[PDB]
């Protein structure tokens, strides 16, 4: 029996922060909206006992009680290739002493789940001598190298709270949906973000067939698609059938669709996004946003680009909006405030450019062509300048 376990390991929030937070300690904390916030509660109640404690992490979801102001001299808050997050705690590089993270409750085994976030959570679970873990009723039971047994907690905090949601198309961000999905093929595995160009991108797709997934991260656009038949990765050569991620968030509707379904399966980011295990998805196409590009080619995000260079019939397509500041500021410079040898197309709402296989002339301009057209003639006269 391993619920005997289970009763002789479980605490408040309080006495695992007061037992596990030793002076000097540096803790980490699991992420997006598995974020174990009861704890964070609970260190702030306890400040008042805790000395040098480091935290680490990324996104937190609700999260408040760490950069109180109060927290000084209590606990502070330390820190682009996110698959080599993992390797900062399993090489040492943030000595790791206790793994804060909330999972879900265990199955009939004494197995939980990660639920929503493998990414770089269960990595650090791994490599931590006392792992903090919330038990919530709460937390979907999904699969995949997602999980982790109740011997190797040393606090539970059982409790139950609904996961953070975050709840996520437009005019000109359509248009860009539109485009890309010119590129984009009955059968192919795609990788995007979240946000109106990803749900964009989803919004353009419903006449595609057989699409697969293996993205670091997704929203209820994903669910959408699944539901309607479209997101079905039968083509899939990894991981056939199932659509794989590192981690997810959104509404209450997503938690409860992946809670417990067969064809969802998380894994970690040491993994997801690694060129290398990308690579092996045929058609593997990943599409990113980035803030500004240049005139020749220039700007997870980076990760999927190599490891979508490496699939049989991939591609990489970065995609966003020819302005900023309400059209007075182009995203498509001569000079940025990463080099070019990355990219093979780029969307806007003015359309396509290919990049693969482009001189440094071609490229130039090729942009300029689907740049605002406020902007194309100082563009065009830059080239020139260089010709």
Known sequence: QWQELYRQRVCSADEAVVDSLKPGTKVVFGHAAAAPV?????????????????????????????????????????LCHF??????????????????????????????????????????????????????????????????????????????????????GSDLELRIGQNCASLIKDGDTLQLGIGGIPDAVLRALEGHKDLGIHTEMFTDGVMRMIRKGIINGKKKTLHPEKVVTSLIFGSKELYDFVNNNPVIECYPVDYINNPDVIGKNDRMVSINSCLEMDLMGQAGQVDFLRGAKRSKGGISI?????????????????????????????????????????????????????????????????????F
């Open 318 to 386: 970065m995609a966003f909006p020819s302005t900023a500041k309400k059209g007075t500021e182009s995203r498509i410079v001569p000079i940025l405030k990463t080099g070019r040898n990355e990219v093979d197309y780029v969307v806007t709402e003015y359309g396509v450019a290919r990049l693969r296989g482009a001189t440094l002339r071609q490229r130039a301009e090729a942009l300029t062509a689907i740049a605002h057209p406020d902007f194309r003639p100082a563009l065009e006269e830059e080239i020139r300048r260089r």
């Open 83 to 168: 698959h080599e997050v993992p390797e900062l705690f399993r090489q040492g590089f943030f000595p790791l002493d206790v793994a804060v993270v909330q999972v879900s409750t265990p199955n009939e085994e004494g197995y939980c789940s990660f639920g929503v976030s493998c990414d770089y959570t269960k990595a650090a679970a791994e490599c931590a001598p006392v792992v903090v873990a919330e038990v919530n009723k709460q937390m979907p039971f999904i699969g995949g190298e997602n999980l982790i047994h109740i011997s190797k907690l040393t606090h539970i905090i059982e409790v139950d709270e609904p996961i953070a949601e975050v709840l996520p």
């Open 38 to 78: 009861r704890f964070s509660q609970a260190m702030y109640r306890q400040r008042e006992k805790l000395e040098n404690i480091t935290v680490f992490h990324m996104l937190y979801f609700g999260d408040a009680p760490h950069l109180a102001p109060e927290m000084r001299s209590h606990v502070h808050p330390t």
